[PDB]
Amino acid sequence: MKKLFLVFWWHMHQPLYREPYTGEYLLPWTFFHAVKDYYDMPAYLKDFEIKLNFNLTPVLIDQIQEYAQGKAKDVFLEAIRKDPDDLEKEEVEKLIEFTKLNYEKPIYRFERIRELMNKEKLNREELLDLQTLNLLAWCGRTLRKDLKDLLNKGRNYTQEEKEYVLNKYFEIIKKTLSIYREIKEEGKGSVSTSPYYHPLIPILLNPNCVYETTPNVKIPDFAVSFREDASKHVELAKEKYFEIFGEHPVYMWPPEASVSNEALELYYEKGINMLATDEVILKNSVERASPYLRYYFRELISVFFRDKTLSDLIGFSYHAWNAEDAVRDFIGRLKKIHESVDFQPVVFVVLDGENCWEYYEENGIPFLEKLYSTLEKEEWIETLTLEEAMRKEDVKTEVIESVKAGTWFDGNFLKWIGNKEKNEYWKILIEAKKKAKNDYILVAEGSDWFWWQGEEKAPFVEVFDKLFRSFVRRAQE
């Protein structure tokens, strides 16, 4: 039986939202994705006999732990917790602004929410319903079974009921990292990490890599070397991973899939046996290649190239489809891969495993359950872990000697560096690096601060600016 080997690799990450001075989490994104996706995404492995793999950034692990110990001073979460009689006019306007942001998402389809947003002024019981429905909207698959009566109520929520939800949600956060241990040890999946604060490792090692694919861009003058800090990102990522899982990682997901000959060298020197990247990178690097192979980079490291169209379909396309149609198309694509090649192909599906489901019907539960049950049924599809794909001798291997430096965003670094706006943050970083004293300069090297710079007016940009300028200034003291 000729087989298609399928590898799913969900990448979980949130940048550090904890402002160093006040210690307050300025954005509740870590919390809301932790109750909705971070626990429940690996939890499918208990219900379905398939293999699934997960990447966890160390910075996200720090924030998950802080909430699980009851230490995060989350300013928005404190507003939900409060009795509505306590809320200031600015706390209420914040709770409305958040609801307006998520209004069109299918996980906010409540008839009550439709009514509050059309109301003029909200009373204490109406604010209670708004506080509580904002919590229930981000209910993961596990708790959507336990809070069926609360979710069926839809309206008229009391303060003790709202507290009951919050207690269930925090129990989920305390459970999150354990279920990653459990699935790793029972062999249902592999777990990788990324460099600590999710930086663009290629730019840190050699900023001239931006010119491999875009030879005319104007990047700032790098009067300091980011080469040791890039080593710290890997070196500390391995120790944080050691803390949770009790062993060094050998698999790593490069942030934003960014690779280079210099970065692939650095990963190998840190004991990384395997990493993956985009197949657009493969097209730029090798001549007439197929992403369905295992690749030996210079006989040092193993590289895999994700099937870009398949991963893009899940992350950006299937949300507007019926679940049955989405899975049927997906399997139909896999069938065409199985016949287009003369060998047993491997298909890597890598994408962010938290951000696409809020736009899905029922938070992607029908699609995910339909897909996982379907893959279980298909005899010819064998889902693998990262370790299994490493040992798999049915997969054809080829050697390559170089790669073009780029990311899974068009194969270049234009989304983070380039024009004057993206470059202003880098100049701020370099001058801070010049006078840097502590490791907060590592936090300022995260890709997320340079992604959100001035491309198009986006939600809570003022917060990402306030946070990046905070770490930069904290690193100089």
Automatic annotation (TrEMBL):
GO biological process, one term: carbohydrate metabolic process
Keyword Nuclease: no
Domain Glycoside hydrolase family 57 N-terminal, chain residue ranges per copy: 7-398
Gene Ontology molecular function: catalytic activity
Coiled-coil parts of chain: none
Keywords per UniProt: Carbohydrate metabolism
Family listed: Belongs to the glycosyl hydrolase 57 family.
Protein name: Glycoside hydrolase family 57 N-terminal domain-containing protein
Originating organism: Aquifex aeolicus (strain VF5)
Taxonomic lineage: Bacteria, Pseudomonadati, Aquificota, Aquificia, Aquificales
